[PDB]
Amino acid sequence: SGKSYPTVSADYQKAVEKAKKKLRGFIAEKRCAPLMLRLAAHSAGTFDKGTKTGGPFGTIKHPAELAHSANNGLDIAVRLLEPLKAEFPILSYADFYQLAGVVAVEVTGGPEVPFHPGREDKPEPPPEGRLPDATKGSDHLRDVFGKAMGLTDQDIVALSGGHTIGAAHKERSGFEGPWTSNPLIFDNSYFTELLSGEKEGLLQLPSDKALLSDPVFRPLVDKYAADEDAFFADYAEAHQKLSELGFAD
Ligand code: HEM
Ligand SMILES: [C-]#N
Description:
CATH class of the largest domain: Mainly Alpha
CATH topology of the largest domain: Peroxidase, domain 1
Radius of gyration: 17 Å
Largest sheet: 2 strands, antiparallel
Shape: globular
Number of domains: 2
Strand content: under 5%
Bound molecules: protoporphyrin IX containing FE, cyanide ion
Number of strands: 2
CATH architecture of the largest domain: Orthogonal Bundle
Structural class: mainly alpha
Distance between the termini: 9 Å
Number of helices: 11
Strand order of the largest sheet: 1-2
């Protein structure tokens, strides 16, 4: 909604198509889908709607942005992608990283998130401190996703489901371990696990737990735990919106 996508050349679109295929093979082989999804989200989640600053515009590769404590470990992701990115000099880094996030979801068995090219690489990284804080709750989630990014309550719960793949690392955030028993499979298990309680070996952040006690978020958690198809639909809508923050209006 509200989007007017820019025109790109036929050669640009050719490169998008080829890069999508190469990303599938690379991400599957390297087992790095969750890291690439986190990279795409950290690139995009810095958007502030009031000022029109931050967002998915290639700035995460800058040494100054990688230095941010919230971005611990994402230097690995940027380095992993550099050889492949160099095969597609016509593409912006901004588009490349968002394409990698879309592919991460697809190769782990998730929905096909629509992708539109044309993001420009911008000079100035956003200020530090805009990304969500795992130790806070529902008010904080609405401040970051709602007041800054401009996303809905539905988007917040669906996007939290991205944690269905991957794990935390004590050397990165400090939290440790996977949210699910199948951390390379994109499914609704994040929500099933959140409901069943604190299982041995699995992770729940305070920000995950905040979904369970909020009057708006909880019915969404229940819906996604019962209906994977509904989760996939809402997730695809939310990821597309996140990947396009500040882009094409
Ligand atoms: C809702 C607010 C969010 C909070 C509080 C949060 C917090 C965190 C934290 C603390 C980690 C662990 C980092 C580490 O130690 O390696 C993490 C990892 C991850 N996050 Fe989030 N995040 C949020 C939103 C998102 C969103 C919107 C997405 C994408 C849709 C996402 C995708 C991921 C993925 C895939 C990982 C696993 C990374 C890996 O396996 O290396 N997160 N998140
Ligand atoms: C997660 N960032």
